Write a protein that binds this ligand. Structure first.
Ligand SMILES: N[C@@H](Cc1c[nH]c2ccc(Cl)cc12)C(=O)NC1CCN(Cc2c[nH]c3ccc(Cl)cc23)CC1
Ligand SMILES: Nc1nc2c(ncn2[C@@H]2O[C@H](COP(=O)(O)OP(=O)(O)NP(=O)(O)O)[C@@H](O)[C@H]2O)c(=O)[nH]1
Ligand SMILES: [Mg+2]
Ligand code: NA
Lengths: 469, 167, 166
């Protein structure tokens, strides 16, 4: 038979499942809704482990339970009463013999020890992967240290001592590869000559590589705390989502730099060379699976100032037209081909973050926080599972590092890029559009001629890499 | 077969804009949504006795990707310009959204509707009359919607489709 | 994208977690933090086919030895890990092999035998003894180092191939 449980009057987590406290989806069960007590019971269930559920719960619980209250509840879960001696045990003791204690030993082995270990696994994951709760609330950290540091008894000892050390390391807080990274490539600008760095003087291969390292680092830095609760859209977004916003602002700045390079090149032949070079950078982004970079270029080419430059795109080689067209097609039909391509490639990659943001926001806005059943309000956990499926996908692509060498001066050049200068956004984008009208006027105004601005060769070195011994 | 209309929702972030399309496309009568689902943004409807397909682009949450707005806007035949009735700044943004649409579409007469969205019970700061005056100065319809009761949602989208049909 | 459920089992301290984190993050973990249960995901192209690996990293400490049936039920394939400088961990392999066979009620479960820490000179389990055991199980034997990455992709992706041909 099943093990008997403590009385629900002394231990709240022994109340029977009912539709008034838990609802399952239609081979471990999947929870649709429940009370916080039932969610924590299943988070730490004696019959099975559920690592996905631990991640989902720890990522999303603050929408229905405060961190201080979560800690109180898992401490309550941990403190399980042991059953009293049975009739057979009583009779043995009355005869001066040692009882077999069969039911007690089974309850320890099959209920207490698994539940207690799974509570500790929640604590371990909380500290290792969601430590921001403790950075933001020093008293919460004190309570966790006290709880862990006072667990007695030898069954849990190895993990209690380990978690104590992990906490202490997190308070005061290296890559190996299958091969060597390729050699850094140089074109007109030579190493150390940062004053000459520009779109056409750096090697297009190395522009794409160094932007990919920068954009990968920005992508990898975004934590789920910046996403849950749609906080990057709210009034405190600069406080709550700084790494996400830094990532987006880099993407916006590079797109605007591409547009500015194009429309400030007034000579037609030179502007064709500029556009052709940017499409070559896009080709290397594609080879590197840097989809953020691909869409940075596509966004620039479809901006109002650039899209209308028919005389320029007429002279682009047909093959480069095809490269740009197939990159544009990734975004069509609500990113249908992009989503399929992302799910087919071999990482490392840099995803486009915008789709994730829209899906998290709409999942939050389009589903209710609670479900009302039998007069009770149950936490709608299905909604939180959907959000954590998205944050889990984001995290999966954050693991794989690029095998490319940093060039510190090229890195600094792109980190310091500032096409808008001190201008406000509307000012600047109106400037770019007026430049577009200057260099290719609306029909029937005639096309003017403009002098060259570049003193160095415009011929591209191409985007196939070289390899000296 | 039937005509497909490509509609684009634009407007300030952080003030409930996404509720408009969610409430439209939703199982109207079950408060639930999975936006990742293929064609959570397509809906077959009958407007004035004529069946058509609405394809709605709402990039809510991507407002900080400001240099992508041109590309997203160029996909659209008609536009819902949305502000929140308790956020005056979102209302003041409308002028620049309309100017950007006109530039991207290269037309002074782009089908569009002005939508004032009630996203919570916080105090209204943009009065109906202010928004009606703005819409009239542009020559476009004004529709007010609730983000909670679905009121006005059908009217906003159907009015826009009529603007496209009568362009 | 086909999904594969891999489970990493073996005695405490043999390097199950270090192997998994090297595969996932290209990083070697120096610390010895005993696992309770951890799970990782990895999209990767293997023999031209994209798949999604779900990797369960399990507890080797004996205090968790009564909690294994639940993860053995869900796993499709098992990396059975010992350390080549720890003869007791090699002797523990057969207990994991027999438990997996019982739980899954099958003589034909995808498995790979892994001898980890092959960067260390002071070996106490000879390759021949481990290879003999692997042959008796009908499975391949792969020596690995979570520290240097030697053999790590080979071990995990060989297991994927055995699930795919199962
Ligand atoms: N059927 C073609 C023939 C053609 C002439 N010039 C071309 C250049 C490229 C391609 Cl593929 C086709 C042509 C057409 O009439 N294109 C017009 C609209 C597009 N612009 C190029 C453009 C600017 N920004 C972009 C961003 C993405 C993409 Cl896909 C393209 C562009 C040209 C004029
Ligand atoms: N030299 C060397 N040390 C290794 C290797 N793999 C793991 N180690 C070291 O061995 C120790 C235990 O590693 P760990 O991955 O935690 O082992 P585990 O099998 O996961 N332990 P548990 O069963 O308790 O979770 C760590 O100090 C780790 O750095 C290896 O290939 N070479
Ligand atoms: Mg481990
Ligand atoms: Na206001």
């Amino acid at each position: 038979g099943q093990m008997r449980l403590p009385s629900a009057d002394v231990y709240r987590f022994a109340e029977p499942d009912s539709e008034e406290n838990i609802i399952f989806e239609e081979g471990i069960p999947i929870i649709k809704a429940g009370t916080v007590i039932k969610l924590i019971e299943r988070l730490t269930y004696h019959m099975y482990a559920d690592p996905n559920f631990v991640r989902t719960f720890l990522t999303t619980y603050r929408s229905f339970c405060k961190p201080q209250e979560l800690l109180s509840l898992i401490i309550e879960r941990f403190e399980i009463p042991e059953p009293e001696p049975t009739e057979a045990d009583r009779i043995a003791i009355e005869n001066g013999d040692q009882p077999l204690s069969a039911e007690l030993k089974r309850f320890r082995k099959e209920y207490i020890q698994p539940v207690q270990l799974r509570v500790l696994n929640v604590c371990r994951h909380w500290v290792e992967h969601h430590f921001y709760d403790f950075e933001r609330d020093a008293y919460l950290l004190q309570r966790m240290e006290e709880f862990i540091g006072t667990v007695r008894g030898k069954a849990m000892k190895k993990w209690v001592e380990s978690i104590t050390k992990i906490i202490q390391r997190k308070k005061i807080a290296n890559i190996t590869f299958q091969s060597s990274p390729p050699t850094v490539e140089w074109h007109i600008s030579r190493p150390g000559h940062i004053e000459t760095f520009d779109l056409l003087t750096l090697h297009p291969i190395e522009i794409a590589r160094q932007l990919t390292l920068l954009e990968s680092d920005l992508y990898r830095a975004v934590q789920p705390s910046e996403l849950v609760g749609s906080v990057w859209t709210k009034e405190d977004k600069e406080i709550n989502s700084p790494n996400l916003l830094k990532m987006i602002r880099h993407t916006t700045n590079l797109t605007l730099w591409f547009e500015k390079c194009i429309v400030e090149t007034e000579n037609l032949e030179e502007r064709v060379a500029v556009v052709s070079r940017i499409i070559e950078i896009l080709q290397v982004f594609q080879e590197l699976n840097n989809f953020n970079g691909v869409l940075e270029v596509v966004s620039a080419m479809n901006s109002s100032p650039v899209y209308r430059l028919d005389h320029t795109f007429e002279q682009i080689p047909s093959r480069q037209k095809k490269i740009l067209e197939e990159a544009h097609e990734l975004s069509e039909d609500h990113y249908k081909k992009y989503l399929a391509k992302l799910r087919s490639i071999n990482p490392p990659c840099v995803p486009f973050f915008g789709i994730y943001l829209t899906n998290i926001l709409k999942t939050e806005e389009g589903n209710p926080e609670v479900l009302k059943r039998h007069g009770k309000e149950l936490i709608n956990f299905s909604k939180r599972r959907k959000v954590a499926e998205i944050t889990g996908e984001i995290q999966q692509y954050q693991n794989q590092p690029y095998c490319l060498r940093v060039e510190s001066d090229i890195k600094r050049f792109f980190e310091n890029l500032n096409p808008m200068g001190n201008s406000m956004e509307k000012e600047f984008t109106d400037y770019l559009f007026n430049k577009s009208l200057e260099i290719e006027p609306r029909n029937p105004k005639p096309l003017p001629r403009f002098p060259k601005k570049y003193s160095y060769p415009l011929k591209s070195p191409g985007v196939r890499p070289s390899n000296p011994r | 077969g039937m005509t497909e209309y490509k509609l684009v929702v634009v407007g300030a972030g952080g003030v409930g804009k996404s509720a408009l399309t969610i409430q439209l496309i939703q199982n109207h009568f079950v408060d639930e949504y999975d936006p990742t689902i293929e064609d959570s943004y397509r809906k077959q409807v009958v407007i004035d006795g004529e069946t058509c397909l609405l394809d709605i682009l709402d990039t809510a949450g991507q407002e900080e990707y400001s240099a992508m707005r041109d590309q997203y806007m160029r996909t659209g035949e008609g536009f819902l310009c949305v502000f929140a009735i308790n956020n005056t700044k979102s209302f003041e943004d409308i002028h620049q959204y309309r100017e950007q649409i006109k530039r991207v579409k290269d037309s002074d007469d782009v089908p569009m509707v002005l939508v004032g969205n009630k996203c919570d019970l916080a105090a209204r700061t943009v009065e109906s009359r202010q928004a009606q005056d703005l819409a009239r100065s542009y020559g476009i319809p004004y529709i007010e919607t609730s983000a909670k009761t679905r009121q006005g949602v059908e009217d906003a989208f159907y009015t826009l489709v009529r603007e496209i049909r009568q362009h």
